[PDB]
């Protein structure tokens, strides 16, 4: 390398600077604050009961962590169909808040809940736009809602002149007028009740059993987001040149423990010229220090090509602990100038021959 | 449920000096024994601060509020553009227990108020709240000086606070005290004008001793000094004097 940089086949005695040495990072770590304030899903999914389909129970979800891993991986849900977004990446993608619509429908009516669908439930009870984003989760409730004497607590809208617009609840009990004869608020010759009650029984067949269905819709208005999935936090390793991602701020260096006293609100510190110099872990609230990974120049000490061919190597300003073909080589010396490989330190003292630094220098005898 | 009032009370608004009060921590960054120059939106040194003994006031950039409060009769705050059902209005209430915050299209009357029934339950500030999204509850906030700074930046309401025991009679003291961040609200409204609540004894409202100080903020450059512990101990206003 000395010959190549110097561009000759002969090298005079001296010290030459050839290249640079930089420690490389080992692995990555990310830490995030404790997962807390779980979105209220269990109180909705596994509540005492559900509302009727024409009077579907609507809930607004905001300011919480929305864990979908257990939601997606739950095996007790009969149907789990997501249209707008991929269920697997739901833990990553997130909108500013969520809406929940919970109700009870018959088994055959499960497929009626889809964009661009027509039917009694799909038109007179609830409508979904073709641009819907979110998921639909349906599960059996025959053991819960179906009654052996006939479940009459759930009703569906059957008579209405026009179809419901998407995201609209109609609770009007006006008696539908089948014919041209207006009715004074009661059924009659050409009038009937718009709402019809179910007859759910455990003896009912496939598709005739009460199914509890929750539709989750994600909305991302320009307001700051409040609902997002959990963030995985890895473990932390000290005294190793690594790259880290503390709570959204990234940096590369060795991460040690520090005794600085922060203040109950300020997260991370910095020293001067706007360089990050201390962080506090969101999990444990400890003041850790950051130091850039080691680097320096390398120099080759030679006594002259005319004399010999053996050389020594100096790594400048590098701690003599992580040097690594000369990973071990000869005996290794540590000085204020750096680390020296290929030379041995004696107790004598002569005139200086090849200046090394910090008061020491080298010569040939080896 | 709130109605008109015949006694058109007027607050004896006087003026006084702001001195060197109203300095807060601009960022969550720790710094140790340094002199950092920061350009931001503060309360200019030795300004003209207004004193009151529920008037309508503008918000402008941001509002500094102070009270050498006794018994904490002052309770809440109203913010918004029109303070009606036509626009979202922010509401803050602080009582002896868990404090509450809403943003709703509250339909305020001419003289909204809480009212206390002397065991107390009276709340008729608004009349309707039909369309609204966000709500919030948090721990209680509060002879002794209390200083608050209210700001609103890019859909982010911000409340800074500080408390001190004081013995001076009337005016602001010649002291220095940094303001710690207290609460952030990541909600976007076009707040441009605000109000002030009162705890009147209703059974005939009796609210006459309501003294508090109000000031306004402007953009400028400051030079802050951090000690060994990273607490702001002194500041210098750049655009005040040639010496500064
Ligand atoms: C993060 O959650 C943990 C819950 O495991 C909190 O408390 C930990 O509790 C266990 C058992 O009592 C202790 O062994 C740990 O040392 C605790 N963690 C810490 C960081 O002390 C923990 O307090 C939560 N983090 C914060 C900042 O409150
Ligand atoms: C920075 O904070 C520390 C911690 O409070 C201060 O040191 C304290 O000083 C008081 C008064 O002498 C002692 O009673 C405490 O034992 C000290 N705590 C320690 C040393 O941990 C220190 O004075 C502060 N620096 C200032 C005010 O400049
Ligand atoms: C049903 O909801 C409850 C609510 O606390 C929850 O504990 C339970 O695990 C849920 N059952 C599931 C997810 O199978
Ligand atoms: C090496 O040095 C000796 C004496 O200094 C000289 O005679 C010889 O020619 C030199 N050889 C080379 C290759 O420079
Ligand atoms: C030089 O002398 C000191 C003290 O006499 C001794 O500790 C050291 O080992 C000596 N150096 C070598 C290379 O032996
Ligand atoms: C504050 O304003 C009033 C009138 O606006 C004025 O008389 C007074 O001098 C001002 N204060 C100072 C310190 O200039
Ligand atoms: C007032 O205190 C009561 C009692 O705890 C509680 O409703 C809440 O903390 C406060 N409510 C309002 C509306 O200020
Ligand atoms: C909310 O506003 C919409 C118009 O955008 C209106 O149709 C609806 O009735 C309002 N809801 C309430 C509860 O006032
Ligand atoms: C005023 O607030 C300060 C701040 O904590 C407190 O120490 C003081 O006791 C309060 N005043 C009274 C009269 O309680
Ligand atoms: C505030 O006003 C601007 C301009 O009138 C408008 O673009 C913006 O949407 C308003 N903010 C909100 C939250 O509506
Ligand atoms: C009107 O109210 C003010 C304070 O609100 C009070 O000082 C004054 O005595 C009141 N006057 C009457 C007639 O009630």
Swiss-Prot record, chain B:
<feature type="region of interest" description="Disordered">
    <location>
        <begin position="115"/>
        <end position="130"/>
    </location>
</feature>
<feature type="domain" description="BetaCoV S1-NTD">
    <location>
        <begin position="1"/>
        <end position="244"/>
    </location>
</feature>
<feature type="glycosylation site" description="N-linked (GlcNAc...) (complex) asparagine; by host">
    <location>
        <position position="4"/>
    </location>
</feature>
<feature type="region of interest" description="Putative superantigen; may bind T-cell receptor alpha/TRAC">
    <location>
        <begin position="227"/>
        <end position="244"/>
    </location>
</feature>
<protein>
    <recommendedName>
        <fullName>Spike protein S1</fullName>
    </recommendedName>
</protein>
<feature type="glycosylation site" description="N-linked (GlcNAc...) (complex) asparagine; by host">
    <location>
        <position position="229"/>
    </location>
</feature>
<feature type="glycosylation site" description="N-linked (GlcNAc...) (high mannose) asparagine; by host">
    <location>
        <position position="190"/>
    </location>
</feature>
<feature type="glycosylation site" description="N-linked (GlcNAc...) (complex) asparagine; by host">
    <location>
        <position position="131"/>
    </location>
</feature>
<comment type="subunit">
    <text>Binds to host ACE2. RBD also interacts with the N-linked glycan on 'Asn-90' of ACE2. Cleavage of S generates a polybasic C-terminal sequence on S1 that binds to host Neuropilin-1 (NRP1) and Neuropilin-2 (NRP2) receptors. Interacts with host integrin alpha-5/beta-1 (ITGA5:ITGB1) and with ACE2 in complex with integrin alpha-5/beta-1 (ITGA5:ITGB1). May interact via cytoplasmic c-terminus with M protein. May interact (via N-terminus) with host bilirubin and biliverdin, thereby preventing antibody binding to the SARS-CoV-2 spike NTD via an allosteric mechanism.</text>
</comment>
<comment type="function">
    <text>Attaches the virion to the cell membrane by interacting with host receptor, initiating the infection. The major receptor is host ACE2. When S2/S2' has been cleaved, binding to the receptor triggers direct fusion at the cell membrane. When S2/S2' has not been cleaved, binding to the receptor results in internalization of the virus by endocytosis using host TFRC and GRM2 and leading to fusion of the virion membrane with the host endosomal membrane. Alternatively, may use NRP1/NRP2 and integrin as entry receptors.</text>
</comment>
<feature type="disulfide bond">
    <location>
        <begin position="104"/>
        <end position="132"/>
    </location>
</feature>
<feature type="disulfide bond">
    <location>
        <begin position="2"/>
        <end position="109"/>
    </location>
</feature>
<feature type="glycosylation site" description="N-linked (GlcNAc...) (hybrid) asparagine; by host">
    <location>
        <position position="48"/>
    </location>
</feature>
<feature type="glycosylation site" description="N-linked (GlcNAc...) (hybrid) asparagine; by host">
    <location>
        <position position="95"/>
    </location>
</feature>
């Amino acid at each position: 390398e000395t010959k190549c940089t110097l561009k000759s086949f002969t090298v005079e005695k001296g010290i030459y600077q050839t290249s640079n040495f930089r420690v490389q990072p080992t692995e990555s770590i990310v830490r995030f604050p404790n997962i807390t304030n779980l979105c209220p899903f269990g109180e909705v999914f596994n509540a005492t009961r559900f509302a009727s389909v024409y009077a579907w129970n609507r809930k607004r979800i905001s300011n919480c962590v929305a864990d979908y891993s257990v939601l997606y991986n739950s095996a007790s849900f009969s149907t789990f169909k997501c249209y707008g977004v991929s269920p697997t990446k739901l833990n990553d993608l997130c909108f500013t808040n969520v809406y929940a619509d919970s109700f009870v429908i018959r088994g055959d009516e499960v497929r009626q809940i889809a964009p661009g669908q027509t039917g009694t439930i799909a038109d007179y009870n609830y409508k979904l736009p073709d641009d819907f984003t979110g998921c639909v989760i349906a599960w059996n409730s025959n053991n819960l809602d179906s009654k052996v004497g006939g479940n009459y607590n759930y009703l569906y809208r059957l008579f209405r002149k026009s179809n419901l617009k998407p995201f609209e609840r109609d609770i009007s009990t006006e008696i539908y007028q089948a014919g041209s004869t207006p009715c004074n608020g009661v059924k009659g010759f050409n009038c009937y009740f718009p709402l019809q009650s179910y007859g759910f029984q455990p003896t009912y067949g496939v598709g005739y059993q009460p199914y509890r269905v929750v539709v989750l819709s994600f909305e991302l208005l320009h307001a700051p987001a409040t609902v997002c999935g959990p963030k995985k936090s890895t473990n932390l390793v000290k005294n190793k040149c690594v790259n880290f991602n503390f709570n959204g701020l990234t940096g590369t260096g060795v991460l040690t423990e520090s005794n600085k006293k922060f203040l109950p609100f300020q997260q991370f510190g910095r020293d001067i010229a706007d360089t990050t110099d201390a962080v506090r872990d969101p999990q444990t609230l400890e003041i850790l220090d950051i130091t850039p990974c080691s680097f320096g120049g390398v120099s080759v000490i030679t006594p002259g090509t005319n004399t010999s061919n053996q050389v020594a190597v100096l790594y400048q300003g590098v701690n003599c602990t992580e040097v690594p073909v000369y990973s071990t080589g000869s005996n290794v010396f540590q000085t204020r100038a750096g680390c020296l490989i290929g030379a041995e330190y004696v107790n004598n003292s002569y005139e200086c021959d090849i200046p090394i630094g910090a008061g020491i220098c080298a010569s040939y005898q080896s | 449920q709130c109605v008109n009032f015949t006694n058109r009370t007027q607050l004896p608004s006087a003026y006084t000096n702001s001195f060197t009060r109203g300095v807060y921590y601009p960022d969550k960054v720790f710094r140790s024994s340094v002199l950092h120059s920061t350009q931001d939106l503060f309360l200019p040194f030795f300004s003209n601060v207004t004193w009151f003994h529920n008037p309508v006031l503008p918000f402008n950039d941001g509002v500094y509020f102070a009270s050498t409060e006794k018994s904490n009769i002052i309770r809440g705050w109203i913010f918004g553009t029109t303070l009606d059902s036509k626009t979202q209005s922010l509401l803050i209430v602080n009582n002896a227990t868990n404090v509450v915050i809403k943003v709703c299209e509250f339909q305020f009357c001419n003289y909204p108020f809480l009212g206390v029934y002397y065991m107390e339950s009276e709340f008729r500030v608004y009349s309707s709240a039909n369309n609204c999204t966000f709500e919030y509850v948090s721990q209680p906030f509060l002879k002794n000086l209390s200083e608050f700074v209210f700001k609103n930046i890019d859909g982010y309401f911000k409340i800074y606070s500080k408390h001190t025991p004081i013995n001076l009679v009337r005016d602001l003291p010649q002291g220095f005290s940094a303001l710690e961040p207290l609460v952030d609200l990541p909600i976007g409204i076009n707040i441009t004008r605000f109000q002030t609540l009162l705890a009147l004894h209703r059974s005939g409202w009796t609210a006459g001793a309501a003294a508090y100080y109000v000031g306004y903020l402007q953009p400028r450059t400051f030079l802050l000094k951090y000690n060994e512990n990273g607490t702001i101990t002194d500041a210098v206003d750049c655009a005040l004097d040639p010496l500064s």
